[PDB]
């Protein structure tokens, strides 16, 4: 279906607290979060608006892939447009630029 863009170049993920009463003010390291997502979920195919439940250091979060950027191997530059359309999907790699964005509630620090 994809033809060439089989891998995830950059991935943008909205992080939210699953439980409102479990808001905790710890400073969360993006690199560790990315590592956690990759170690738990590797080479998995992802779409926009796909949801996930994430367990980091005992804390449960709801993750919403807001948009996806699919690129083929061998593309030096990320010239590909980031698609908000759910059709675009790709396969996770250990090098995807993972940007985490505050949820609509905006409590994750």
């Amino acid at each position: 279906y994809s033809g060439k863009q089989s891998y995830l170049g950059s991935i943008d993920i909205d992080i939210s607290f699953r439980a409102r009463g479990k808001a905790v003010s710890t400073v969360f390291d993006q690199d560790e979060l990315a590592k956690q997502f990759v170690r738990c979920y590797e080479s998995q195919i992802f779409s926009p608006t796909q949801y996930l439940i994430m367990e980091f250091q005992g804390h449960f979060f709801d993750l919403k892939i807001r948009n996806v950027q699919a690129i083929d191997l061998g593309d030096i530059e990320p010239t590909s447009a980031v698609a908000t359309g759910i059709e675009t999907k790709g396969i996770l790699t250990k090098q995807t630029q993972i940007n985490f964005f505050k949820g609509r509630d905006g409590l994750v620090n």
Partner: protein
């Protein structure tokens, strides 16, 4: 001041000509000039709107302002007291020609 010591500025700009160009600028206009020049440089990277998401370390890792950005910036900020000499420069839009000796004598006198 800080730009220069932080090595965020091209070596081509020389302050003397800037000081020459800004005839009737007040003290409070120069800062706006700085702002606009910066805005041009920074917009060159982000391209707000259409070509979004190009942000990356390489782009931001070599940002420097350029002289032509200042030259461009002169078109946004305008003096407030230097509004009447504009009439004088537009008075000779028809050009000047030396079809006769007489004009030279008059100008010399």
């Amino acid at each position: 001041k800080k730009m220069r010591e932080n090595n965020m500025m091209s070596d081509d700009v020389n302050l003397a000509e800037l000081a020459a160009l800004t005839k009737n600028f007040s003290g409070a206009e120069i800062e706006g000039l700085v702002k606009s020049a910066s805005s041009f440089a920074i917009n060159k990277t982000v391209n707000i709107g259409k070509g979004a998401t190009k942000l990356n370390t390489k782009d931001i890792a070599k940002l420097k302002v350029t002289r032509e950005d200042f030259l461009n910036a002169l078109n946004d900020v305008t003096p407030a007291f230097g509004i009447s000499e504009e009439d004088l420069k537009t008075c000779v839009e028809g050009g000047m020609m030396l079809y006769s000796e007489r004009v030279n004598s008059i100008l010399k006198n």
